[PDB]
Amino acid sequence: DDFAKLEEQFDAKLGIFALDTGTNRTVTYRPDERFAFASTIKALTVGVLLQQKSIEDLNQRITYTRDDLVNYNPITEKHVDTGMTLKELADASLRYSDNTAQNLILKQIGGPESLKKELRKIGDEVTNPERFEPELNEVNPGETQDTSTARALATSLQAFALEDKLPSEKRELLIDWMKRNTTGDALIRAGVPEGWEVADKTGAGSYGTRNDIAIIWPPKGDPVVLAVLSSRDKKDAKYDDKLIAEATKVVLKAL
Amino acid sequence: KDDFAKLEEQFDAKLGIFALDTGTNRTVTYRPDERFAFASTIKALTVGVLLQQKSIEDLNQRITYTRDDLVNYNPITEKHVDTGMTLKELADASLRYSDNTAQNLILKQIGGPESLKKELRKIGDEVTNPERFEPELNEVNPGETQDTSTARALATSLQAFALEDKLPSEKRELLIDWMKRNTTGDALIRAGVPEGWEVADKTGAGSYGTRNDIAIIWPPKGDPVVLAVLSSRDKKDAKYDDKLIAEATKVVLKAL
Numbered sequence: 001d002d003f004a005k006l007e008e009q010f011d012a013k014l015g016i017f018a019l020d021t022g023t024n025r026t027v028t029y030r031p032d033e034r035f036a037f038a039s040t041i042k043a044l045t046v047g048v049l050l051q052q053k054s055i056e057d058l059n060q061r062i063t064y065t066r067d068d069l070v071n072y073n074p075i076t077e078k079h080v081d082t083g084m085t086l087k088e089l090a091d092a093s094l095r096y097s098d099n100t101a102q103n104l105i106l107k108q109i110g111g112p113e114s115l116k117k118e119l120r121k122i123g124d125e126v127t128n129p130e131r132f133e134p135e136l137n138e139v140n141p142g143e144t145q146d147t148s149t150a151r152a153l154a155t156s157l158q159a160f161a162l163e164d165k166l167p168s169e170k171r172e173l174l175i176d177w178m179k180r181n182t183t184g185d186a187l188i189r190a191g192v193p194e195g196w197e198v199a200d201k202t203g204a205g206s207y208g209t210r211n212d213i214a215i216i217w218p219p220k221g222d223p224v225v226l227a228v229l230s231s232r233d234k235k236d237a238k239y240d241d242k243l244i245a246e247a248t249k250v251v252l253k254a255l
Numbered sequence: 256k257d258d259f260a261k262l263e264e265q266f267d268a269k270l271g272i273f274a275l276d277t278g279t280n281r282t283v284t285y286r287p288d289e290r291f292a293f294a295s296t297i298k299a300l301t302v303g304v305l306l307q308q309k310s311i312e313d314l315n316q317r318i319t320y321t322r323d324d325l326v327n328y329n330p331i332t333e334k335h336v337d338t339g340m341t342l343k344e345l346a347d348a349s350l351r352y353s354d355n356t357a358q359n360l361i362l363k364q365i366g367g368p369e370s371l372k373k374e375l376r377k378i379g380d381e382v383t384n385p386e387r388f389e390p391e392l393n394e395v396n397p398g399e400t401q402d403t404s405t406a407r408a409l410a411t412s413l414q415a416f417a418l419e420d421k422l423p424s425e426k427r428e429l430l431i432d433w434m435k436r437n438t439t440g441d442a443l444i445r446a447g448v449p450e451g452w453e454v455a456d457k458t459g460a461g462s463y464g465t466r467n468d469i470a471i472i473w474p475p476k477g478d479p480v481v482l483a484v485l486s487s488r489d490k491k492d493a494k495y496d497d498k499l500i501a502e503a504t505k506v507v508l509k510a511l
Contacts, residue, residue: 017280019280022379023379023381023407023408023411024273024275024282024407024410024411024414025407026280026282123278123279123477123478125279151279151280151281152279154280155278155279155280158280164420221379222379
């Protein structure tokens with residue numbers, strides 16, 4: 001009811017799944033309820049890219065045009081003249097939530113259909129990617145296109161970052177990028193004790209959707225996998241980052 | 256689950272269950288953190304620590320023991336007193352036949368109960384409390400934590416050794432292979448799993464009608480399910496019934 005109380009206080013629906021990999025203790029709340037995944041899908045996209053590309057393959061330069069630019073391209077629109085390596089695009093996508101970077105990377109792996117096939121392969125039968133950015137934001141209550149659950153997103157993130165879906169060196173690249181995320185200071189990072197390391201990917205969308213998925217490392221112990229999702233009832237509703245920070249505090253306490 | 260509560264009532268036993276579908280992170284729990292005497296299940300965790308300290312080659316090392324070293328149940332070790340046995344042979348005997356002397360010999364090889372506990376603490380297991388050798392570890396009374404653990408801790412520790420990076424792939428398949436070929440659990444978890452499902456388990460039984468089984472199960476299509484099913488009764492000399500674990504397993508499967 002600590003989570004229910006937060007739902008009332010922020011007038012939002014909460015989706016939570018946390019797993020302490022050291023003890024298999026979990027914290028759940030509407031863990032299997034669908035939410036549009038928004039930008040969090042960028043983390044899983046790079047995971048699949050790392051699966052199919054050698055580290056040298058990431059130095060390959062990708063060329064695009066102004067015509068390839070979409071709604072939010074903080075880094076990509078600054079290099080349209082020179083193109084960018086896949087390594088640079090993965091960096092932009094994960095640390096700045098660059099939409100064009102996500103689109104170029106998605107094309108590299110075969111598009112949404114291939115992304116979905118690869119996730120189904122690793123055991124994710126829930127995440128349903130269907131579109132590129134920013135069209136994936138066009139989700140209405142009741143539909144499953146471009147949605148997932150807290151359990152599914154957390155489990156797929158764990159698969160790529162902590163399990164054997166990727167070899168050591170590649171897991172480390174993914175974790176390093178996410179640890180250096182620039183957009184999540186007010187979310188999960190704001191709800192963990194000082195000294196805890198966080199690797200996360202945030203997201204936001206229509207219906208006041210505000211998400212954050214992460215791997216958290218206590219100073220002493222095994223990592224904790226956490227997915228905190230949320231949405232509101234109005235398409236144009238505004239979100240409040242504090243809901244995520246507060247929900248995280250409850251999770252840490254519970255753990 | 257009401258289904259678990261009914262089994263507890265029917266068999267006059269207490270159940271400790273923890274199941275985790277590693278592919279979906281879905282779990283099935285029932286008194287997951289209640290302590291039970293681990294009995295023979297500790298043999299699987301002991302071998303895990305052994306593989307962690309010795310190289311595959313070191314496992315070839317011969318071990319010499321006498322009749323002095325034989326205890327209350329030595330189906331295998333009783334046939335090699337003079338020849339001796341290699342660590343690999345002892346591990347095999349301990350895991351597949353629940354050989355008690357083998358367990359003790361291996362326990363000594365890794366440093367004794369204190370060392371086993373220390374290593375388990377090192378991998379994240381803060382509840383499993385090994386203190387004695389076989390068969391003394393069976394001397395446990397309600398309220399005491401000596402030689403007890405929980406379904407959650409036992410399942411998690413098994414997963415760490417068999418499915419996680421606690422052991423190199425090479426040693427992990429050695430452990431899984433022995434357990435897959437266990438000869439003592441046909442009427443337990445194995446009896447409650449659907450046809451086509453592969454099982455790697457280690458059974459156990461003890462005082463107060465304690466009857467346990469910890470396993471890694473592989474469905475035809477899918478990632479493994481780690482499962483720990485523990486049980487006990489209120490009377491020290493209480494008799495256990497394997498059907499309880501088989502039935503409890505069927506519920507876990509339906510749930511998953």
